[PDB]
A paper describes a structure:
Influenza A viruses are categorized by their surface glycoproteins including hemagglutinin (HA), which binds sialic acid receptors on the surface of a host cell and mediates fusion of the virus with the host endosomal membrane. While only the H1N1 and H3N2 influenza A subtypes currently circulate in humans, the H2N2 influenza virus poses a distinct risk.
To assess epitopes targeted by cross-reactive and H2-specific head-binding antibodies, mAbs from B cells collected post-vaccination were isolated and characterized from six participants from blood collected 1 and 2 weeks after H2-F boost. nsEM epitope mapping revealed distinct patterns for each mAb group: H2-specific mAbs targeted a variety of epitopes on the HA head including RBS, vestigial esterase, and antigenic sites Sa and Cb, while the majority of cross-reactive mAbs targeted the RBS. We compared the H2 vaccine-elicited RBS mAbs with known neutralizing RBS mAbs to identify and dissect molecular features associated with broadly neutralizing activity. Another common feature of H2-specific neutralizing RBS mAbs is the presence of an aromatic residue that interacts with the conserved W153 of HA. Overall, H2 vaccination elicited novel antibodies that targeted a variety of epitopes including the RBS and antigenic site Sa. All maps were of sufficient quality to build atomic models of HA bound to Fab except in the case of H2’s cleavage site, which had heterogeneous density and was omitted from H2 models.
Author numbering:
A (entry chain C), F (entry chain H): 1 to 35, 35A, 35B, 36 to 82, 82A, 82B, 82C, 83 to 100, ...
B (entry chain A): 47 to 54, 54a, 55 to 82, 82a, 83 to 92, 92a, 93 to 125, 125a, ...
C (entry chain B), H (entry chain A): 394 to 443
D (entry chain D), G (entry chain L): 1 to 107
E (entry chain B): 193 to 242
The structure:
C-alpha cells in the first residue's frame, strides 16, 4: 500500500517562499501511470488544483498560480515538492499531496496525504 | 585461389574456431579464448561447431542474430547488470554440464538466478543505455523437467519472466515437462535477444526461471557480411574476395 | 510494385529481396550495355558494308 | 474551461433515508466525472472514479449515474458514516476542477 | 481500475481464425506519457462467415 | 512420494561379493534429473560416498573403491544395485541407498533409504 | 580434492539455546555446501540444500549462512527434536565428501 | 555475402534462396559461354577481314 506523507506545518511571511515536501512510500514515483499533484483547501472553500507533475517529468500549472508555483520530482528519494514564490495572506490553506491515476478512461485522485497547514501572515 | 583465409579489405574475420555464435556470446566456459574480439568483417566458424550451448537448450531468432552479427565489425562488452546487485538472490549457481576441471560452472556472461533463504523475491532490474550506442541484450528462461526441480531452485511454481523496452513486449512462462536427456540434463534453456536503442530502458522482471545478463554488447559499426564455414585459420594476408577454400585476388 | 515492407526481425528476408533486385539489376545492366555496344559495332559495320 | 455547479449546497437526512446529490457541467464532459467524500478534518476520499464506477472499499450503497452534463450521486440508504461533504470533479479538461461541495447533515 | 477482473482474456474467431490472448501486465518505459501498450490484430472475414 | 528400499542384511566372508539391491518406488528411475548413490557408514564414522550412477547410465566411483565396486541401473524393475568385490573386515558398515538431486545450482541427497547392515568376517 | 573441517566435534546446549556449527573448506566451494541432520539409528535427513536454502519440512529455526570457505549452520532456538549429529557436504567437487559431524548434546 | 542461415522449419524459404542462386547461375553461365563463343567468332572474323 502506497502512502503520501507531507512535511510539517509552518508560518511564512508575505513575499516568502512556501516549501512543502511529500515523501512517497510503498513504491517508486517513477513506476506506473501516475501523476502527483498538490491540492489546496482554504478553510471553508472548495478544493483547488495547484498543479500537477507527471511521472515522466511533464508539468501543468493552474493559471492563477503558474507565474508563482513550481512542482518538482526527485526520483532518488521518492519525493515531490511544492514551491510557491511570492506568498500572500490569501494563500493560507491546507495543502494536500495527492496521487492521481493517469489511466486513459479513468482520471482521479486515488491516494491523499493528510494535509499540511500553511499560514501566511505579517 | 590462395588456399589461405585472409583479412577482408584489411579487417580480419572473427575467429570462433570450435565455438558457435551462441557459445561465444553467452560465454560457454570453453570459449574464453575468443574474448579478444578483434574488429571483424566476416565471421569464421567451424561447420558443426562443438562449443555451443553447454547446457542443452535453444536460441530464438538465432538465425536472425547470426545475420545481425556479421555486420558488427566490433563489440564492446559492457557490464550492464553487475551480478552483485541481486543481493536477495543466489548468483553463484551453475551446472555440471558446463563444468570446468570437474567443478560446476556456467556461461560466463550470465547470471542464473535462484532462490536465497526461503524465497525468490521478484527479481527486477533495468538499464537506460547511456553507453552512446545500441546494445545487444541476451537473456533466457530455464525450463525444468520436474516440479521438484522448479521448487528446489525457484520456490514459486506458477512463474513468469517479463522483459520489455519502448518497442519490446515479451512475456513467457517455463514449460515443466519430461524431456530426453541431452548432455546429462532433461532440462532446457531458452534464450532470446533484443536490441536496446540509445537512451531507451530495458526492464526485467521475474518470479522465477530467469537467467539475467551480466553483460550486453555495444554494436558500433553497422555494415553487412556473412558467415563462412571452414575448418582453417586466419593467415597474415589480405584479400578483396574470400571463399571457404581460400582467398581470391583477381580482376577477371 | 518494387519495394516491400519488412519488420526488423526479417532482415534475413529483406536481404533476399535486396539480392533479387541487385541480382536482376546486374543482369540487365550488363546485358543492356553489351547489347548496345554489340549492336553499335554491327550497325556501323552494316553501314560501311552497304 | 468548463464551469461546475453542484446542488443542494446542503441537505439534511435521517439515517436510512435515500439521498441524492446533483452535479452539472456547463459543457459535456462525457463520462469523466468522479466523486469524493470528505470528512471534516480529513483529506477527501475517492468514492467514484468514473461515472457509475466505485472504488474498492466503497460501500455498495454509493451508486453513481448520468452522462455528459447531468450526473447524480445516490446513497441508497444513508449511514452514520456518511455525514460528509461530497464533491464532484470533471477530469475531461486540463483544469481538473471541483464542484462546490454538498454537505449531508444529520436530521 | 479499468476492467475489474485480473485473469482476463480476449478471444476472437471465424470459420478459419482461432485466436486467443491474454494481457501482459508489466513495467514498461513510458512512450508518449504512457507505460501501457495496445496490441492490434486483424483478420479477413469472408462472405457469409461470422 | 518416492521411497528407496534396500534389500535385507547379512554376513559375508572375506573375499566374497557384497550385493545390495535398492527398490525405487513412487516414480521411475529414468524419469528426472537425478542420480543414485550408495553411502556407507561404518559405525562411529563419517558418511562415505561409495559411488554414483546417473539416470543416463554414467558412473563415478570413489578412488579407494573403484577397483572393487560396481553400481548398475535396471530400468525394467526400477532397481539399482551395489556390487562390491573382494570384501574385507574393514567394509563392515551400514549401507544406505540415496537419491541425489542433479539440479545445476543444487546438489544434495534428498531421499534416503533406511540402511542395511552388512558384516564381513571369518 | 577439497578437505573438510567441521567443529565443535560436540557441544552441549539447553533447550531454547542458540546453537552454531562451523564448517570449513580447504578451498572455496562457492555456495555448494549442503547440511544434514542425522538421528542415531536413522538415515541422515537433508536440512539445507545450498547455503541458506532449507528443505521443505525443515523448521524455520534452521538457517544457513556463509560463502566460499566459511559456512555456518545456526539453530535459532534448540528444540528436543534437534539432538542429532549434523553434517556438512561439499558438492562442488567430483568427490562429494562430508565433514566430521557435530554432535549436539543435551545440557 | 552469399549463403544464408535458415532453420529447419524454413526449408520452403531456404529453397527460394537456393533458387535465386541457381537461377542467376544459369543466367550467367549461359550468357558467359555464349558471350565468349560469339565474341570469339567475331574476333576471328575481324582478324581475317583486316
Ligand atoms: C536515460 O538517460 C537520458 C540521458 O541522460 C543524461 O545523460 C546521461 C549520460 C547521464 O549523464 C544523465 O545523468 C543525464 O541526465 C535521459 O534523457 C535526458 O532527459 C533530460 C531531462 O531529464 C533532457 O534535458 C532537457 O532537454 C530538453 C531538450 O529536449 C531541453 O529543452 C531542457 O532544457 C533539458 O535540457 C535531456 O536532453 C535528455 N537527453 C537525451 C539524450 O535524451 C533519459 O530521460 C533517461 N531515461 C530514464 C528512464 O531515466
Ligand atoms: C449469414 O447470412 C446468410 C445469408 O442469409 C440471407 O441473406 C441475408 C442478407 C439476410 O437477408 C438473411 O435474412 C437471409 O437469410 C445465411 O445463409 C443462408 O441460409 C439459408 C438457410 O437458413 C439458405 O437457404 C437455403 O438454401 C438452400 C441452397 O443451399 C436451398 O436448397 C433451401 O431451400 C434454402 O433456400 C441460404 O441459401 C443461405 N445463403 C447464403 C448466401 O449462404 C447464413 O446461415 C447466416 N449465418 C448465420 C450464422 O446465421
Ligand atoms: C593481387 O595480384 C596482383 C598481381 O600479382 C598484385 O599486384 C602486383 O604483383 C606483382 C607480382 O606479380 C608485383 O611485382 C607488383 O609490385 C604488384 N603491384 C603493386 C601495386 O604492388 C597485387 O598486389 C595482389 N593483391 C593482393 C591483396 O594480394
Amino acid at each position: 500500500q502506497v502512502q503520501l506523507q507531507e512535511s510539517g506545518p509552518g508560518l511564512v511571511k508575505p513575499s516568502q517562499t512556501l516549501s512543502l515536501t511529500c515523501t512517497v512510500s510503498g513504491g517508486s514515483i517513477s513506476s506506473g501511470n501516475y501523476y502527483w499533484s498538490w491540492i489546496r483547501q482554504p478553510a471553508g472553500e472548495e478544493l483547488e488544483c495547484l498543479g500537477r507533475i507527471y511521472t515522466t517529468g511533464s508539468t501543468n500549472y493552474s493559471p492563477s498560480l503558474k507565474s508563482r508555483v513550481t512542482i518538482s520530482l526527485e526520483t532518488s528519494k521518492n519525493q515531490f515538492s511544492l514551491r510557491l514564490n511570492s506568498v500572500t495572506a490569501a494563500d493560507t490553506a491546507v495543502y494536500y499531496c495527492a496521487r492521481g491515476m493517469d489511466f486513459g478512461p479513468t482520471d482521479a485522485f486515488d491516494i491523499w496525504g493528510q494535509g499540511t497547514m500553511v499560514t501566511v501572515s505579517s | 585461389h590462395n588456399g589461405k583465409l585472409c583479412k577482408l579489405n584489411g579487417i580480419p574475420p572473427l575467429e570462433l574456431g570450435d565455438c558457435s555464435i551462441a557459445g561465444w556470446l553467452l560465454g560457454n566456459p570453453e570459449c574464453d579464448r575468443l574474448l579478444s574480439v578483434p574488429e571483424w568483417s566476416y565471421i569464421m566458424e567451424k561447420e558443426n561447431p562443438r562449443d555451443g550451448l553447454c547446457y542443452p537448450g535453444s536460441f530464438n531468432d538465432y538465425e536472425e542474430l547470426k545475420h545481425l552479427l556479421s555486420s558488427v565489425k566490433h563489440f564492446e562488452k559492457v557490464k550492464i547488470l553487475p551480478k552483485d546487485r541481486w543481493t536477495q538472490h543466489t548468483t553463484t549457481g551453475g551446472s555440471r554440464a558446463c563444468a570446468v576441471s570437474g567443478n560446476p560452472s556456467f556461461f560466463r556472461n550470465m547470471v542464473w538466478l535462484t532462490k536465497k533463504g526461503s524465497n525468490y523475491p521478484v527479481a527486477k532490474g533495468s538499464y537506460n543505455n547511456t553507453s552512446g550506442e545500441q546494445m545487444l541484450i541476451i537473456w533466457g528462461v530455464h525450463h525444468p523437467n520436474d516440479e521438484t526441480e522448479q521448487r528446489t531452485l525457484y520456490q514459486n511454481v506458477g512463474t513468469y519472466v517479463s522483459v520489455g523496452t519502448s518497442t519490446l513486449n515479451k512475456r513467457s512462462t517455463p514449460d515443466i515437462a519430461t524431456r530426453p536427456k541431452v548432455n546429462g540434463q532433461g532440462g532446457r534453456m531458452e534464450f532470446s535477444w533484443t536490441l536496446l536503442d540509445m537512451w531507451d530502458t530495458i526492464n526485467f522482471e521475474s518470479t522465477g526461471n530467469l537467467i539475467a545478463p551480466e553483460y550486453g554488447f555495444k554494436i558500433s559499426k553497422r555494415g553487412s557480411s556473412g558467415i563462412m564455414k571452414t575448418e582453417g585459420t586466419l593467415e597474415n594476408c589480405e584479400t578483396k574476395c574470400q571463399t571457404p577454400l581460400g582467398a581470391i585476388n583477381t580482376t577477371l | 510494385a518494387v519495394g516491400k515492407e519488412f519488420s526488423n526481425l526479417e532482415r534475413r528476408l529483406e536481404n533476399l529481396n535486396k539480392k533479387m533486385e541487385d541480382g536482376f539489376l546486374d543482369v540487365w545492366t550488363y546485358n543492356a550495355e553489351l547489347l548496345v555496344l554489340m549492336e553499335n559495332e554491327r550497325t556501323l559495320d552494316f553501314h560501311d558494308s552497304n | 474551461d468548463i464551469q461546475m455547479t453542484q446542488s443542494p449546497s446542503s441537505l439534511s437526512a435521517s439515517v436510512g433515508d435515500r439521498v441524492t446529490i446533483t452535479c452539472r457541467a456547463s459543457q459535456s464532459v462525457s463520462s469523466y466525472l468522479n466523486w469524493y467524500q470528505q470528512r471534516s478534518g480529513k483529506a477527501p476520499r475517492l468514492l467514484i472514479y468514473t461515472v457509475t464506477n466505485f472504488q474498492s472499499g466503497v460501500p455498495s450503497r454509493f451508486s453513481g449515474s448520468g452522462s455528459g452534463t447531468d450526473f447524480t450521486l445516490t446513497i441508497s440508504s444513508l449511514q452514520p458514516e456518511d455525514f460528509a461533504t461530497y464533491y464532484c470533479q470533471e477530469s475531461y479538461t486540463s483544469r481538473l476542477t471541483f464542484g462546490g461541495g454538498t454537505k449531508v447533515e444529520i436530521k
